[PDB]
Symmetry: D2
């Protein structure tokens, strides 16, 4: 008769103790947890406009609560044109890259939406600026996401693993429900917006055909595409398979953004033992040039991402 032993607050504080931290990253991670519970509650009474305004309130809660951690120096949002450089009084050493509410366009239809964040330690000697945001994702300290779906889950990936925490909204505590999550090696679902079929490169084309009409005449792959990144990525982690948003007429730049959509999700993928590629390079090694830079991303189970990379290599 308990609150199932490992709550998020407890877990973060123990992992901060084991790593002999200053308590600055714990304060930061405690602040993202308060922010996500305030966004989950606002998402759930979705109006008692509400896309533009709920995305605005979400932006405002993540920025104000993160400044209050006294742990950040630069903040990058999908919503703000330029980076937020924190006030010298509130400055800590972390750079945080976030999407306060992914899939806002889907709010009206009531589709699962989510918050995506990546945390970097500030590296330079220089007075904080946009430049400190621009590290490859290989340099991420912690990264993860909250999914506001049928229930709200937080997936936190750090250096040592991926852990899933389910909000108990009755007490406002995230409980550890799944630990050291590893993705399947080969799954059975492919996920892409097939309305772009005529824009696709010939490797993506060949692959999709291979999943629908398997040459070895095994069972085809199911298709699922919620059209909300956190939800398609999350389903992939749990059930297995591949998620694709390649280059097509959105240039070989693609739609999703590197710093706050692709990199957090790629870090979660490599940590649960899967892959994240642009088709050419690993997403985590790309050196950013802009904070709102976009990148192709293909991620998911290992044996499904390698099979497509083989087709990519066959078209060279």
């Amino acid at each position: 008769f308990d609150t199932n032993i490992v709550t998020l607050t407890r877990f973060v504080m123990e992992q901060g103790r084991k790593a002999r931290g200053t308590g600055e990253m714990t304060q930061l991670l405690n602040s993202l947890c308060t922010a996500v519970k305030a966004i989950s509650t606002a998402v759930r009474k979705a109006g008692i406009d509400q896309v533009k305004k709920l995305d605005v309130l979400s932006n405002d809660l993540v920025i104000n609560v993160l400044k209050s951690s006294f742990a950040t120096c630069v903040l990058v949002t999908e919503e703000d044109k330029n980076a937020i450089i924190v006030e010298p009084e509130k400055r800590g050493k972390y750079v945080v890259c976030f999407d306060p509410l992914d899939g806002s366009s889907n709010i009206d239809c009531l589709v699962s939406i989510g918050t995506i964040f990546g945390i970097y330690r500030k590296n330079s000697t220089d007075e904080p600026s946009e430049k400190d945001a621009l590290q490859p994702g290989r340099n991420l300290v912690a990264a993860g996401y909250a999914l506001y779906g049928s229930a709200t889950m937080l997936v936190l990936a750090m250096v040592n693993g991926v852990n899933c925490f389910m909000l108990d909204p009755a007490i406002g505590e995230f409980i550890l429900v799944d630990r050291n999550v590893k993705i399947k090696k080969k799954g059975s679902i492919y996920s892409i917006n097939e309305g772009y079929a005529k824009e696709f490169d010939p490797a993506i084309t060949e692959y999709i055909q291979r999943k629908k009409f398997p040459p070895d005449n095994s069972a085809p792959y199911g298709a699922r595409y919620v059209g909300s990144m956190v939800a398609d990525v999350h389903r992939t982690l749990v059930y297995g398979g591949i998620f694709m948003y390649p280059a097509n007429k959105k240039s070989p730049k693609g739609k999703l953004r590197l710093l706050y959509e692709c990199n957090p999700m790629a870090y979660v993928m490599e940590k649960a033992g899967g892959l994240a590629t642009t088709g050419k390079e690993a997403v985590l090694d790309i050196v950013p040039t802009d904070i709102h830079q976009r990148a192709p991303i293909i991620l998911g189970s290992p044996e499904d991402v390698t099979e497509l990379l083989e087709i990519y290599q066959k078209h060279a």
Copy 2:
């Protein structure tokens, strides 16, 4: 200011007053609302097994709260083999066909799931049995669904229209947010599990390729397929387009069941002003033989459903 101006309790009772009834259907409709609020509650914590534990809880909540309205004589659940005949002391004159929790499968992946219902009046003077449930959905008195997605919505369709109500979980009250919902004439999203492409009839095949490669220089349609009927159908109703679960050889009579999944959603679509076909006949005119009868279903905006029906007819 207020809680809302029109609640599902104010609305339901106002309509029973305008309609001049003994208050029995009102009781049934208020019992449905208590049941939805309770399942929403259980769905939003989920785990503080998931799948075949929550849908068992949901079966239980609905059966129990409906017998207590003293308004039902026959209940048909997805979960139960046979039609439940209510004890005479609790019998009323209605037959309710329901899906306790659609897409329960998806609890682990946290995808939008929902509750589906249709209410038929008993009209057959004889001791109530399965018999009374085997009516064409053209005979529905009321139908609708509750969607547990990023927020909870109850959509209810009756004689006079389709109305959408958002749950405010802070006060446990459904508030009318959308009045006399009517679907767009032509949409721009098609929704089908393309992984069955190996098995699709040619009318479905010409349609999808015309959606991906328009003969003229149209923008192709976007594709979305959550894999949960209430979420896909709700997006359709709200934003336009078409949802198809055609006949294919793995489940050659379609997958979805007529009484509790197909008919409520066909009725909601027809009152919103869109179409719902088998491909050969309309879903609402089919007469059941079995309470668990499956049926094919193509539904959505009138112009796009028509455009596929012509292709069905083009194959003769």
Copy 3:
């Protein structure tokens, strides 16, 4: 299993059905329930000024949700100088006298506060005015209160009895927990603000000393006085004893007001089977002259109220 077996929505509508009414009082009684759930919500956060901000919010919620029932023609609030006459487009036939939030004072000290109401039918064919509210509480159609204490309870008394309903805030539903509540004949707790002992008439003085020093070797009565009428009266109803707010020179007509505090609680007490006197006449038989008229009140178990009334009569 269920949400509950009998909800305040099931009960209210079942009674309107048994009673054979146009469903107008039902609408009013369902509007009261929405209003109580919303104030409970605001009372339980309190501060995320308190006092004259929350009671202003509560005044607002009640007036607004009652006009919207289209069931009220005159409203009397503690908060407003004059009786509010409802616009003809929203007028119905009832007069509601209410205290939006009793004991608002105590929000800072976090003591149990409550909402008090009495409903009178208009019976006076003339354009509605204050006039219609100035009826003896013997004329009440329904009365009761909501108590925001450790849990929320709504107690409603009508013709046929007093029933207690507990709010389940998880589903926003009031569940019948106590049916046909009847008060104990003799209690063992007296409740008065003894700091006015300098000003009390001698009948009150002989009573209290007989409670503290029984002439025989009885156990003396315990004393409790929360200082919030709904909490003191609720304890009385539920556990027995007497609550006294006698006449004294600072407020010589008593403090508590007849229409919205005294009469509802006198009516609840009389249907629970206890007594409610001024000391000289019963509170329910007094005819108002002013909507904000004050009145003395002694109420509780029949044997203890009697025992003080004899001492009043012993002084002649």
Copy 4:
């Protein structure tokens, strides 16, 4: 658009950093916060028996969640006859003395009830036992209480002050609403169960008379006595005055218990700058002999406790 800057988690972690703690007392204080939110939620749906069973669940949540902190070695509850000595694997260095749910007898009447806790650092070299609980309250590290009233508040008193945190139940976060709370020097309310008037010593008797018929002929003191300790003590802290539960026929032992009712509350009182006396000695200096030992307590504003101590001294 925030979660009003200083949440309890943030405050505790900063104060743990400033004191260069190991993070063991932060883990303990984070665990009492989870426990209090799980008890507040259970208290608020008070049954959807429930006195004996809710006090039992409360006991079980505080013990299981405190063991899980890995910060305690001995636990003393009102509910357990003997002290709980923790398992060597879960052992930390703190002794915690608590009342999991004060005022449970009042649950049926819906009176404010609360949780009271005192934390001691274990002092001996010896294998932990009842003996480590038995320190004077002068040796308390931290002490405080949660009040489940109109809203839920946590009052935390530590070496440097008293801070009041209001639960925002919407997000499950305690927000700092009042800091470095100091009690008034003289208030205007006295609080005692006057049903014991004939059991009272002559100093308590003289005092009460002095408050009701003030010799200097100033204004009498109001009386308030909820009969729930956390609620009478809390009202005293905020509004001022005195709270008394002296010796009478419950011997010069009194009813309230030293380790978990009186000492936490006395520590809060001295820290907000008031007094807590048995009439003879300060409650914080008493050397306990038993864990379930009782003690007289008189606490509140300074100028009111000294005035009574003068009367105590006059009766010698």
